């Protein structure tokens, strides 16, 4: 209910109109998605390679709902592991 719809969104995005700067990121995401790889790593790579392309001005309007879905509640990090190292790391 997550990977399939993410694939559909990426497929719809990569054909309408895409600039060359994020073409590499989208292609890398698709290549790591069809390959059986960890979803959070794909999400992090897709989200991190778009921050300059988003904040400055551009974030091409075609890939707007894609960034919205990647920055949603489920796809975020919550820093569970880093927190466990930081907080519970020396507890026991």
């Amino acid at each position: 209910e997550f990977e399939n719809e993410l694939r559909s969104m990426l497929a719809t995005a990569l054909e309408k109109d895409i600039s060359q700067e994020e073409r590499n990121a989208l292609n890398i995401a698709e290549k790591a998605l069809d390959n059986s790889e960890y979803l959070p790593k794909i999400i992090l790579n897709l989200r991190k390679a778009l921050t300059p392309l988003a904040i400055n001005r551009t974030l091409n309007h075609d890939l707007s709902e894609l960034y919205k879905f990647i920055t949603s509640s489920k796809a975020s990090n919550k820093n569970l592991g880093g927190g466990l190292i930081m907080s519970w790391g020396r507890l026991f």
Partner: protein, 54 residues
């Protein structure tokens, strides 16, 4: 014999088997506890990303 229960910044909590009560033994001084907290926190921040891998 003392069984380990939990570890804090200054000292650890044990259970005494000769008696039947949990006993806290303090091992770190205020300077030592503070320094250990600084080092542990910075190394736990370094263990994961410093924010660049979240």
């Amino acid at each position: 014999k003392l069984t380990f229960i939990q570890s804090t910044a200054a000292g650890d909590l044990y259970y005494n088997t000769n008696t039947h009560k949990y006993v806290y033994q303090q091992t770190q001084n205020a300077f030592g506890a503070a320094a250990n907290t600084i080092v542990n926190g910075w190394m736990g921040g370094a263990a994961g990303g410093f924010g660049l891998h979240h």
